Ligand binder design. Structure first.
Ligand SMILES: *[C@@H](CO)[C@@H](O)[C@H](O)[C@H](O)COP(=O)(O)O
Ligand SMILES: *[C@@H](CO)[C@@H](O)[C@H](O)[C@H](O)COP(=O)(O)O
Ligand SMILES: *[C@@H](CO)[C@@H](O)[C@H](O)[C@H](O)COP(=O)(O)O
Ligand SMILES: *[C@@H](CO)[C@@H](O)[C@H](O)[C@H](O)COP(=O)(O)O
Ligand SMILES: *[C@@H](CO)[C@@H](O)[C@H](O)[C@H](O)COP(=O)(O)O
Ligand SMILES: *[C@@H](CO)[C@@H](O)[C@H](O)[C@H](O)COP(=O)(O)O
Ligand SMILES: *[C@@H](CO)[C@@H](O)[C@H](O)[C@H](O)COP(=O)(O)O
Ligand SMILES: *[C@@H](CO)[C@@H](O)[C@H](O)[C@H](O)COP(=O)(O)O
Lengths: 223, 223, 223, 223, 223, 223, 223, 223
């Protein structure tokens, strides 16, 4: 399972990249607009993320019509080979996806909330599809069930579109995605940092350290 | 999973095809005769649909006897290479499918209501088999269960007949078909149009566009 | 399981009532406004339905604010002891339900789409809660799964609110409701009439009558 | 589980009753037509069964209309206290059951092929409902699955109508009925006879006899 | 669960009874005739077992006809109040059980090989029913499954006939019977003797006694 | 799944073959005795079936001893390449199958009633094994459960012997066989006929015809 | 699944071998010492069994120490290429297995009572591992559960050691072994003979032969 | 499944190695510090284990910072080609593993307590990952569940990192690990010795020996 970071915050991205556990980044119009304040320009934010991240970087078109989507998509693609164009699940978007796919431009279909929307995006040739589990949880439906169904459907038809679990809110979304077999999760920075941690790791490390000092007061391993 | 449109209404068909999500069309004598009114001829309706749709188009014979079915089948085949001959599940129908298969004429066995009828159709060499889930629902039996058994039976024997789920009434027939692994669903226009939609898609798009205006008054993405 | 009719059509109501199988009626502002045409007044329609139907008749308030809802509820209540006041799942609706329940006015909480909404309506003292299965099916979620969870939750806490399955579209919503153990279903007229029917019932009756004529030429049963 | 004999053959009935294993009898117009030949009159056959059998005896009305059904039902009831009036699952049939129930005349709703028909019959106050398992098997649906659903539905609502499994064709219909918990099975004579038998019972008997001969040549147990 | 000893060997019976774990005894014509050799009379063997065992003692009739079975049954009953009359699962046997039950003579229906035979025996009013699990194992069917179905059937109908598992060959028949909830098992002496034993019991006792000697050379517990 | 006809009636065989749905035929000494009446000779009946049927035709030996079985088997094989020699599950039968297998004569082991008998037949190299589901149903055991176990065992060991389900009595034996994945079912003619039929197929046909009349009074499809 | 005979009795071995159903033989020091009576020598018995049985013949070492086991194993091996050396699950036994496996001497690890014992034997390179199901049943644990776990463990690691189910007591140990997918069962003679038998096979053969005599008075099959 | 010894005690390791059942060794700073007393130097201890054990030996770094971990790992590596460098699940630890993996130094990520930590370790390229089952048991969580999830996750993604079950406390951790399919278990000496033993093995050997004495007073096997 690949792990992407779901943010437009450059500091967060730089840190996660520096940890070596980030395989890519997702953005969306809300996340970018949060960061493009106090003289910060969105064009600069996007270019900076593309430069810092080796992996796929998803950038969302803002037009709602086919022609505008395809034109924006081409500009996003021109910004770098790791750019992936994020396109909403709408009639115009499926059309754009079909065109872009034939032009060999990688795509990510977003705002997906059920498995049949996901199947339609796959049939358009989308590179990634992004179901929003946390927004389903928000409305009282267990969003991970939709991921499970999408995994079964894609398996049934040997679908090559990657399932990119998005709207992730906690480490159990992550654990369940892995057990299901989702291709990718994209996680907010707070969730990312928690994934490596466990109180028994900390306690175990401390005890080992303590016991080692019994035989090596300096606390080092001399071999 | 292929998605076919189940109608003879040419306006619905043009619209569905323009959306890019329609892989084919199914008709039947009721659907055609609905449109073949007020001067409009059934011969014209059938030809027009064949011209419009790139994918398979199922057209049903009306004869109930072997020789008549085969004669009509061959006329249907002659109207275009994408024509598929719909043949009912009867003794004469199984005979006709077996002959037409040997003549390399694609066939669709219809009016199937249990898994053994579907197996017989596959043994006759039919290209598609069409079990009717909504008409079983109508008589108080969950029609989707028959689709599940057919998928199992076909998997057991490596059967190459495609399961074409028909008499579809709602998007959950479609979802369950995909999870089962049916090869094709054929859906009425109303159902078709709902498949791309979800209220959280609409709401999410609105929010993205409101947030974007904050950093781009004109609402565009200049890259 | 009680069976209500979901319509404001007096002819459908009179017909179903004469069948002896209708235990009540549910209406809503759309169903009523459909029938208040050609000079037909909504006040007359409502009174006429109350008169014809011995069982509970749900009538929806139209105000969206607490004070208006309770004022309308009290007027609805005064139309006959079989009137049930239908109130939507909103903040003010819950406040209204709690007030009306204390006044011993029967209530039906409507526009419920998940089990926690239903639980909150029950906690407010509502008489019936109406989850909308068909509208969930419309958006690619199996609506019956919500009924099953509500049944379990209500059983856990010995909740006396009745589950009234609404937005019913076919006889399998009805079958599944009964197997789950929902208290009530409300069904459109087309669905209601279909519930008694089965082709083997027809075929079986025909054969019995044929066989009887062999021993009783006039088809009589004289004892 | 009660066991009824499904026949109008007087010799079968006397024999089964005299096995001590038969708790009642079901007839229908076909079964009676079979016996009422060569001068034998249906009225005499019906009286004789009522006479010989202590348990319930179901006799079916032939009228298809409400008034005729109720008239014939009252005549059937008049022939003896053990008479149960068989009424088909139709609109008129349900109305008749409701009337007859209020008159304290026992009723058995027949020609039932799905669980919701069975529920409607129960809601009309019927004493027994009779789903036809064998005739569902005939059309490629496992009829015992409808018995299982009806048992669950009736348990859910604490329904007092008895489930009377009919159209029984083999001893496995009988076994599965008992494991499900159906109230009654009605069985043809040849199936009845088979229920007592097993090859290992026969072999075990023969061996006990052979071993006993060694200790007692005359095969008696003298105590 | 009652545990009966399945033998006519008087030495085995005295031993088992002295252990305190034998609640009753079952015999059959083979078991008795095995012991009734070299001068020993079957009448004497039967009487001696009745005297020795406080609990129920099953003794099988040899007659195959109703009148003879009943005559023998009554003689068996007269030998002592703890006598239980074993009657085979045959047409005449069911008749005999029904008569003997009305005479308050306890009965045990034997040579039962499926759950429907067991149900018929219970309907005749039998005190115990004895399905033969080992003889089903002998013919390649897992006999315990029949016990499981019988327990379910009896639970469904609140049947008071006790399930007496017979033809027991090993301690896993006994364990599975207990987990199922059979009322009684009857076991051959060899199987009986193994039930109390386990190698870890033996080893644990040895260790306890070795450890105790360390604080009590004489190996006693002076309190 | 292959479908064979289980009969020796030549009219049935010709009719089924001429439906195109029959892949072979099974006979046995009873079925043949039925036809070999009024001067009709068994040798002529067997030759005629071999002649008319392109697929396998099973013919059963009558000798009960190894030498007679092998002698008769070689004669049966000599009548045509499609002949399959039916051999019962006995000690001599297994020896015969082994010999005949080494001679490249196809064999079908019959009178199989549990999964281990089926395994022994497979180990002897038999071409088909025929478990008798209906005869197990007769003695109160669900015979389809043995087919399920045999399918699992044969899958486990990659066994090439084909499972040929026999003693079929109804269409549900057929459905369950297909869902399990049995290689072949052999069915009596009346069961064969029933497999193609369904009331909704008939009703659907009638309605299509009625609707088509409106657009084409003569009921033709002129293209 | 291979079937071995578990005995040292030459008559049983010769009989089973002549049946064609025995694939090998297992012995152990108890079985051999049973047969080495009346001046019969264990060396002669072993050689005679090796001579009669074409398949694997397991012969157990008697030394408890590593050096003695390997010395005895090498002598066993020299008696014929079909000899398999049976070695107990002990520390020295595992060491011996590892040594012998390297020398390409086939081995069978015996006295195995749990799945981890079996895994350790496999890790030492053993040819067969023999878990003792009947001896577990003796102590109140279902021995077949250990076979199932060993099958799963061996499948997980693609282990080539064969599971040889031993201490078999009845035909259900055999049936369950086949369903689990054990490689071999070894069975006492009484069990082996029972595997071919079933009362419905006998009854069925008798009826066929009776029916045939109606058309062939001499009971012949002349073709 | 590979089996490692979890200890730094040379006496235990030499014993396990001599038994032939030990495939490698794990140590940690606590285990080493326990042995490095009364004049024993941790450096001699590590070297001695490396020498005695043919297979992988895991030795943990003590540094908590990236540079120090990588330096220590290289020293550890240099001590012998069978050295595996144990590195804790921390930020610097994952960085170290990635660097060491690129240097072809085998790594083992320790102090893992949930499946997502295990996945992160795998993603860094670690050779083995060691979840601590016993320490989860200590805090009231069944540690084996985490192993099951890791197995599923690794299977989903065809992950080559080996699952090394650690903190093992009893033989059922070992059994469950094998049933799950973990790649390796590492076990304390007391557990390891227990794995070969079972009381029925001891009992069975004793009996075999007693019976062989009957045939060969001196207990030898002369062939
Ligand atoms: C794009 C799809 O990969 C992502 O940036 C998604 O928009 C976010 O994961 C959505 O999360 P929220 O529900 O927190 O907006
Ligand atoms: C042909 C078979 O694929 C289709 O046109 C079917 O006839 C319809 O799908 C049947 O649907 P209705 O039950 O709604 O007529
Ligand atoms: C009131 C709640 O019982 C009912 O009238 C509901 O509004 C309808 O059942 C809604 O159904 P639709 O989704 O078909 O409007
Ligand atoms: C009445 C209902 O209890 C019965 O006589 C039923 O009509 C028969 O059981 C129906 O069986 P068939 O399908 O064999 O007519
Ligand atoms: C009487 C019924 O409880 C018993 O004695 C049975 O006859 C035996 O239990 C039958 O056992 P076998 O199959 O071992 O004879
Ligand atoms: C041969 C095996 O393929 C078949 O003819 C079987 O004998 C019959 O199918 C047995 O069926 P019955 O139980 O009806 O004789
Ligand atoms: C050797 C291992 O295959 C066999 O001879 C076993 O020793 C026997 O199967 C043991 O059976 P018992 O528990 O009946 O002695
Ligand atoms: C290293 C594998 O990472 C091992 O030595 C583990 O530290 C031990 O297996 C941990 O066991 P405890 O929980 O008993 O310390």
């Amino acid at each position: 399972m690949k792990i992407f970071l779901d943010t437009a915050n450059i500091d967060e991205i730089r840190t996660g990249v520096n940890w070596g556990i980030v395989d890519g980044v997702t953005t969306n119009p809300t996340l970018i607009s949060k960061e493009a304040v106090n003289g910060k320009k969105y064009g600069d934010i996007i270019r900076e993320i593309l430069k810092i991240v080796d992996g796929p970087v998803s950038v969302e078109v803002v037009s709602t019509k086919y022609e505008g989507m395809v034109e924006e998509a081409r500009k996003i693609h021109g910004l770098g080979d790791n750019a992936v164009v994020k396109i909403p699940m709408t009639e115009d978007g499926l059309r754009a996806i079909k065109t872009l796919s034939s032009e060999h431009i990688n795509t990510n279909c977003t705002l997906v909330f059920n498995p049949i929307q996901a199947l339609l995006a796959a049939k358009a040739g989308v590179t990634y599809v992004s179901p929003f589990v946390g927004r389903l949880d928000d409305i009282g439906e267990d969003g991970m069930q939709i991921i499970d169904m999408i995994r079964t459907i894609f398996n049934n038809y040997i679908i090559k579109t990657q399932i990119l679990v998005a709207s992730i809110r906690n480490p159990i979304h992550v654990l369940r995605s892995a057990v299901i077999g989702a291709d990718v999760v994209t996680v907010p920075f707070n969730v990312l940092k928690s994934l490596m941690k466990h109180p028994k790791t900390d306690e175990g490390l401390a005890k080992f350290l303590e016991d080692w000092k019994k035989v090596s007061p300096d606390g080092k391993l001399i071999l």
